[PDB]
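Quick one: structure tokens for this chain, please?
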Amino acid sequence: FKIKDEWGEFLVRLARRAIEEYLKTGKEIEPPKDTPPELWEKMGVFVTLNRYNVPPQTALRGCIGFPTPIYPLVEATIKAAIYSAVDDPRFPPVKLEEMDNLVVEVSVLTPPELIEGPPEERPRKIKVGRDGLIVEKGIYSGLLLPQVPVEWGWDEEEFLAETCWKAGLPPDCWLDEDTKVYKFTAEIFEEEYPRGPIKRKPL
């Protein structure tokens, strides 16, 4: 575990606070002075907002992140949290009252690593329940978090085709040598219920 449980809890609470404060004052909070030093290191992160007490496959309310380590983790979390609440083009922006009915999930990512070898053998180098994926070709790029294939019950080959689709590429694009496929992992933390205890979420 690269991210201590205490740090995951910190980040999830920070994400909720960033969203509520933004919705209330339009201001983006700053990393708190008590922020753990290790959390200033640049890392990729995604924040997901899920509707509470509904079937999981119907819960996604917002999900935005920074796949690359361009921001210190603490700052990336604050921004991604806000973006997931009001800047996810697929859904209407979250209003303050609704935060009573949503649970926050923070996914801290490890650096993506290029999958090597014959393209038709790429499914063998990935593992649903462990890997997140990024597919890139030309100007197209798409990413799907590790929890996605698990939630929908996809195998490695299906997961690949779905990530290609996410990028705006044909489903079988991963069979192309010129298509670049990266795998990455994440340490996930989520509220058990709105404003309740936070816990690590294994796949």
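Residues 1-111+186-203 form a domain with the Glycoprotein, Type 4 Pilin fold (CATH 3.30.700.20).
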